[PDB]
PDB file of C-alpha atoms (C1' of nucleotides) in Angstrom:
ATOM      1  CA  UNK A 158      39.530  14.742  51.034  1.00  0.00           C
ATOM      2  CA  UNK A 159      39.670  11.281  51.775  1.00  0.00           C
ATOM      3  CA  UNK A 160      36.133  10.604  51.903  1.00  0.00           C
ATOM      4  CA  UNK A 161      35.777  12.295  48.563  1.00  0.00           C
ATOM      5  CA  UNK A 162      38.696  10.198  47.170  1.00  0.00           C
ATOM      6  CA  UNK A 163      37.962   7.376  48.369  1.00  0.00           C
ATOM      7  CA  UNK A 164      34.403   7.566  46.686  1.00  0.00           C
ATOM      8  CA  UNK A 165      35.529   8.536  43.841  1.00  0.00           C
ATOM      9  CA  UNK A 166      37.648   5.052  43.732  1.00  0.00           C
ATOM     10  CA  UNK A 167      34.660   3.159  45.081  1.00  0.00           C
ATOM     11  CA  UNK A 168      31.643   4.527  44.472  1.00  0.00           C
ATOM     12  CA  UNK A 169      31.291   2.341  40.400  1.00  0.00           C
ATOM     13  CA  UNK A 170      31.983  -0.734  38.902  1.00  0.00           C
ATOM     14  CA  UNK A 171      33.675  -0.042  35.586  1.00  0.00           C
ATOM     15  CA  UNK A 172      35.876   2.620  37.566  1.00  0.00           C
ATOM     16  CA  UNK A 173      36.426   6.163  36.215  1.00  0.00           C
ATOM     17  CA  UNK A 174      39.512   7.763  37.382  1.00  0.00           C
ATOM     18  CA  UNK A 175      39.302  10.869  39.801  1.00  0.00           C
ATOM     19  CA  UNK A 176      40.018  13.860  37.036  1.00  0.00           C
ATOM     20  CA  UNK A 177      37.570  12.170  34.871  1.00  0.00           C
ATOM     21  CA  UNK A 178      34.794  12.520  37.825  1.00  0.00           C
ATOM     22  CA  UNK A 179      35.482  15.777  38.716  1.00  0.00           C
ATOM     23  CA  UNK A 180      34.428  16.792  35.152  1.00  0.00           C
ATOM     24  CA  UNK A 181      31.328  14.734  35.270  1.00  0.00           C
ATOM     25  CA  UNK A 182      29.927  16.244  38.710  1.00  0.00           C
ATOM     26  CA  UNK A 183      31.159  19.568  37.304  1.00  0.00           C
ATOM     27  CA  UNK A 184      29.187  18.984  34.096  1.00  0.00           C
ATOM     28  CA  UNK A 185      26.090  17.690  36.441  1.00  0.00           C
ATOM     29  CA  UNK A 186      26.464  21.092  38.723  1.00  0.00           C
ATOM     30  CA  UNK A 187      26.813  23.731  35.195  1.00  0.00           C
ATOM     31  CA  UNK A 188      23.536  21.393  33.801  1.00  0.00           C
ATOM     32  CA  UNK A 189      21.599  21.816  36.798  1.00  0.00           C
ATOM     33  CA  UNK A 190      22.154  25.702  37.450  1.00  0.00           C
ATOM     34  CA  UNK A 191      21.460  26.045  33.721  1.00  0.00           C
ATOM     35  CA  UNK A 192      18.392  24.020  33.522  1.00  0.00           C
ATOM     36  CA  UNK A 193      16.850  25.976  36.376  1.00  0.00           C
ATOM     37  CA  UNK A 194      17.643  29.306  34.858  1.00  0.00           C
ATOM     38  CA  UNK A 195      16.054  28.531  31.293  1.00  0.00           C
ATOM     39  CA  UNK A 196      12.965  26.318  32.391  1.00  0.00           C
ATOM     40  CA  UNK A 197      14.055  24.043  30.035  1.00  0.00           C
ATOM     41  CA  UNK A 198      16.672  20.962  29.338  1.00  0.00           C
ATOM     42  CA  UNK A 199      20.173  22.781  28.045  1.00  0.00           C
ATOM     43  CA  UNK A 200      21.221  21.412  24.926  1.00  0.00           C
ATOM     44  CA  UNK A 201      24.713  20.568  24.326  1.00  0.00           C
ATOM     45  CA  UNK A 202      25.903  23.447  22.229  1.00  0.00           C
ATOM     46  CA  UNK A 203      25.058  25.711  25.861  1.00  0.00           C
ATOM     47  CA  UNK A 204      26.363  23.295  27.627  1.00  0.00           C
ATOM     48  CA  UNK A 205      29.704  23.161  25.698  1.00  0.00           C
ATOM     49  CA  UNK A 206      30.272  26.686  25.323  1.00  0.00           C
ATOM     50  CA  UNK A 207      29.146  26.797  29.263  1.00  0.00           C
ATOM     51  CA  UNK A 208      32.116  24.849  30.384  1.00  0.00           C
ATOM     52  CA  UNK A 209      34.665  26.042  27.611  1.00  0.00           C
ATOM     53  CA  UNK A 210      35.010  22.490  25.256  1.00  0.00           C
ATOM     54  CA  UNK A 211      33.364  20.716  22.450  1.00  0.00           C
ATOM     55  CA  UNK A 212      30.064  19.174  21.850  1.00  0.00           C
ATOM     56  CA  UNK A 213      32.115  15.932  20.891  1.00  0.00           C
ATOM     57  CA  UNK A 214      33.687  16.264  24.961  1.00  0.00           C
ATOM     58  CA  UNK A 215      30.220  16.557  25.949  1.00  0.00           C
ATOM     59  CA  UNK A 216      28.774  14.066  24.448  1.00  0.00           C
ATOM     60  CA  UNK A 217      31.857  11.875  25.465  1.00  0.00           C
ATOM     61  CA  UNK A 218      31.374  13.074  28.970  1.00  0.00           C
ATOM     62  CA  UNK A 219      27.899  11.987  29.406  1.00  0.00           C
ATOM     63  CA  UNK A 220      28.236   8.553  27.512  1.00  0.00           C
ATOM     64  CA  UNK A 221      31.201   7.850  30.283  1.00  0.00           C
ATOM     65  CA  UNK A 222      28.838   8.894  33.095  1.00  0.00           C
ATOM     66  CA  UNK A 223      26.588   5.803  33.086  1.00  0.00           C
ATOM     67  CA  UNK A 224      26.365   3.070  35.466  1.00  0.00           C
ATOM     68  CA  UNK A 225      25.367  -0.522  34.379  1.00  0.00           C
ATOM     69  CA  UNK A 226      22.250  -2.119  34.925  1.00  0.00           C
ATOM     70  CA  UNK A 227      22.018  -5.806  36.703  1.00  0.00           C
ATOM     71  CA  UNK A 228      21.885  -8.965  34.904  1.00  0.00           C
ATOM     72  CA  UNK A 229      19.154 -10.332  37.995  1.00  0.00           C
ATOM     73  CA  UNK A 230      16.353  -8.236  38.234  1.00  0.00           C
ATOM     74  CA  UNK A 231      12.861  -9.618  36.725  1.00  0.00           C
ATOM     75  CA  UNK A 232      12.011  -7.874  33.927  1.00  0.00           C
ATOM     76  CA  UNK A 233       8.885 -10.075  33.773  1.00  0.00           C
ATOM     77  CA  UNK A 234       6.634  -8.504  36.198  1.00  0.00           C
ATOM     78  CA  UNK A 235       4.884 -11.391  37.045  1.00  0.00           C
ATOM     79  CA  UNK A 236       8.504 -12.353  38.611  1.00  0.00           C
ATOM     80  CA  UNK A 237       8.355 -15.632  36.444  1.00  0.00           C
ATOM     81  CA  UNK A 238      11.493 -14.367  34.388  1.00  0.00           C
ATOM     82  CA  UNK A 239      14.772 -12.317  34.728  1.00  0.00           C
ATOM     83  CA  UNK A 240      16.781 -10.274  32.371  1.00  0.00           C
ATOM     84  CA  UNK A 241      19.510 -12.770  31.939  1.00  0.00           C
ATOM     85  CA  UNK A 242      17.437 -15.387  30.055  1.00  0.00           C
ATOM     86  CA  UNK A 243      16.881 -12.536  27.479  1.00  0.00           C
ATOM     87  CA  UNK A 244      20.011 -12.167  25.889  1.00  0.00           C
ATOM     88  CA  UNK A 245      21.114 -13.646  22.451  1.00  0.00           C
TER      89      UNK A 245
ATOM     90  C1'  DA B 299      17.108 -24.373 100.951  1.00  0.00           C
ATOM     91  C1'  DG B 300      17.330 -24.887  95.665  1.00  0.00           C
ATOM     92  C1'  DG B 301      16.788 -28.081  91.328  1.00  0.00           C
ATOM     93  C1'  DC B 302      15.415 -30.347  87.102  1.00  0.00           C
ATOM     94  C1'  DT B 303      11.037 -31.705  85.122  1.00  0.00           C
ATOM     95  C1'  DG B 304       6.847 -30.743  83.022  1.00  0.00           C
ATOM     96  C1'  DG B 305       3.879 -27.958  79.948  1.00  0.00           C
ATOM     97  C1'  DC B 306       3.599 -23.213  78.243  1.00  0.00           C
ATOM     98  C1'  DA B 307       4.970 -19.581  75.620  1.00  0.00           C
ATOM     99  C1'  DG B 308       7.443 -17.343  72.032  1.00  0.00           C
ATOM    100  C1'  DC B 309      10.204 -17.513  67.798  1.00  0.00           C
ATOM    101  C1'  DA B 310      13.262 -19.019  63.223  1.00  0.00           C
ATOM    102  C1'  DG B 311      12.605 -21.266  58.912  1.00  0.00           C
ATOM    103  C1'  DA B 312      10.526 -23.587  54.606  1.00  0.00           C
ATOM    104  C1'  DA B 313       6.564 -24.061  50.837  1.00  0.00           C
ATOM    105  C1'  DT B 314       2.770 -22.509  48.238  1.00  0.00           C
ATOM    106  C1'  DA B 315      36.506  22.025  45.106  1.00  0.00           C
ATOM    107  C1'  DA B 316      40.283  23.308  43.340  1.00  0.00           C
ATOM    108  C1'  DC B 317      46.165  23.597  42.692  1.00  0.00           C
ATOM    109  C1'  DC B 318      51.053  21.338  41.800  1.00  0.00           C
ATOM    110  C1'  DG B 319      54.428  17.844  40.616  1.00  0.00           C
ATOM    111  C1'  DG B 320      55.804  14.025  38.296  1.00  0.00           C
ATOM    112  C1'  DT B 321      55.720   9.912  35.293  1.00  0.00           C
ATOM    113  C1'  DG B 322      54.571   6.854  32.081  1.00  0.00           C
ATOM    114  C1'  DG B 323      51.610   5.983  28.079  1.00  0.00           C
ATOM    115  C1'  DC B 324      50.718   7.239  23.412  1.00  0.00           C
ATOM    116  C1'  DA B 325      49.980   8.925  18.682  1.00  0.00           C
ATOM    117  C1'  DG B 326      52.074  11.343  14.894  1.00  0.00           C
ATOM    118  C1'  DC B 327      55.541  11.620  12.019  1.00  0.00           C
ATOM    119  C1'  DA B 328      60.243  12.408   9.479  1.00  0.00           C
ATOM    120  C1'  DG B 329      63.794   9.017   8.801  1.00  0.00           C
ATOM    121  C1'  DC B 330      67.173   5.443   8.824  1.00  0.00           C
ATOM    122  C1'  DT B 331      66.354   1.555   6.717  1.00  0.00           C
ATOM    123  C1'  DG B 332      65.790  -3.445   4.959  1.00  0.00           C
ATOM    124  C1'  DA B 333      63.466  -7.134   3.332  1.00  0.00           C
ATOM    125  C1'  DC B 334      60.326  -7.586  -0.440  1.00  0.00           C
ATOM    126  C1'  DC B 335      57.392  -7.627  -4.491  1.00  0.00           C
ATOM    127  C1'  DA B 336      57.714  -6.767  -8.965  1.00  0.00           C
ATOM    128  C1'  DC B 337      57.692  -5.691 -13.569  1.00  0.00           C
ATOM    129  C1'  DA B 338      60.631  -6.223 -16.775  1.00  0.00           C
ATOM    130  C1'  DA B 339      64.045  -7.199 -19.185  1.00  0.00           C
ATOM    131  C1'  DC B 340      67.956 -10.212 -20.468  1.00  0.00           C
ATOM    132  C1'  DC B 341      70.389 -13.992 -21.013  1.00  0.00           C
ATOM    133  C1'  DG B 342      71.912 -19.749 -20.733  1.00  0.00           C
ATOM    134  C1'  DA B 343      71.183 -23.698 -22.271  1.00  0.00           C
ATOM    135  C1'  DT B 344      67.836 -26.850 -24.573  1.00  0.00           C
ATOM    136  C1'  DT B 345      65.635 -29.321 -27.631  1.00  0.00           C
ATOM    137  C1'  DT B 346      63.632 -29.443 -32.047  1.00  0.00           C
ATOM    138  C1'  DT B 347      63.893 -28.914 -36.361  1.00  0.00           C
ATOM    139  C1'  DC B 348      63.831 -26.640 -40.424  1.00  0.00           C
ATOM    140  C1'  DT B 349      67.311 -23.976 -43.363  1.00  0.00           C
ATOM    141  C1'  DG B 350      70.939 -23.645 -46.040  1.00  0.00           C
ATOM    142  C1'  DA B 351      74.535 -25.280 -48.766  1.00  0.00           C
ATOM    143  C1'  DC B 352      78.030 -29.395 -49.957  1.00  0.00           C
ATOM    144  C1'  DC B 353      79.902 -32.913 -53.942  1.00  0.00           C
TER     145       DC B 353
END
DNA sequence: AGGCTGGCAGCAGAATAACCGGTGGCAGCAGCTGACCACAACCGATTTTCTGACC
């Protein structure tokens, strides 16, 4: 439990609180089992009607569930240039 | 008897899974307002300046 909590409160940077993670690993576990079934990417009418809410809470769900990217890594291959210097 | 001098050798660094309880936020909305536009009228002089009669 603690472990668990604890990464929950850690594990992000914009933090999401604990309820709101334990729908977006159960979404990730109900999209996994279903994708492996179907042999195919569930779209989110099965996956709504899978977990007993909306499209609109799925669609919610997953647009909470992402992690930002970093400011310093060289988008310029050649290393010359970062993604920083690319912003208006 | 060891020691501290000497190279000698080796190395760091820089550049190019769920429950339960509780508690506070919050949004939605009838329901006092209460200050506020807001038309809309209505008058209070005000000044001009004819209008009308006076002898």
């Amino acid at each position: 439990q603690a472990i668990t909590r604890a990464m929950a409160d850690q594990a992000r940077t914009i933090r999401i609180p604990v309820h709101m993670v334990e729908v977006i690993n159960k979404l990730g576990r109900i999209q996994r089992e279903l994708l492996q079934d179907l042999g195919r990417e569930p779209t989110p009418e099965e996956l709504a009607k899978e977990m007993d809410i909306t499209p609109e809470k799925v669609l919610e769900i997953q647009q909470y569930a992402r992690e930002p990217i970093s400011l310093d890594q060289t988008i310029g291959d050649e290393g010359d240039s970062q993604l920083g210097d690319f912003i208006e």
